[PDB]
């Protein structure tokens, strides 16, 4: 059983959510939830929603007893970025990268 759970085109940048991912990597879901609950980042709530969805898929589509579940594979990879032109001084123009990322969560009992 794998019960993956992906959230693509997340608003936050891939880097900024990796810090949150490292906090819960390898840890049991029980401690994962509270850590994300009390972490002061939007990446915390962004990742928390994905982790909640992953637990729901495991409980519903697969075996119950979500208590004995651990986040085996947590990773983030940057996704498509949006190009925006922003004026600067002296009439110059620069490109603003509204970066996005895909968050993948894998929770397994063993």
């Amino acid at each position: 059983m794998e019960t993956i759970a992906k959230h693509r085109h997340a608003r936050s940048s891939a880097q900024k959510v990796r810090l949150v991912a490292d906090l819960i990597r390898g840890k049991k879901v029980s401690q994962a939830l509270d850590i994300l609950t009390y972490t002061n980042k939007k990446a915390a709530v962004l990742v928390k929603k994905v982790l909640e969805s992953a637990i729901a898929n495991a409980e519903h589509n697969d075996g119950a007893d979500i208590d004995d579940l651990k986040v085996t594979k947590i990773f983030v990879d940057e996704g498509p970025s949006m190009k925006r032109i922003m004026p600067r001084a002296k009439g110059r123009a620069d490109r603003i990268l509204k970066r996005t990322s895909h968050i993948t969560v894998v929770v397994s009992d063993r």
Binding site: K90, G91, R92, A93
Partner: peptide, 17 residues
Amino acid sequence: NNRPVYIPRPRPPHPRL
């Protein structure tokens, strides 16, 4: 994706004379 159109005149160099 337009290449920069207006390039400003370069800053005058220090006189090495």
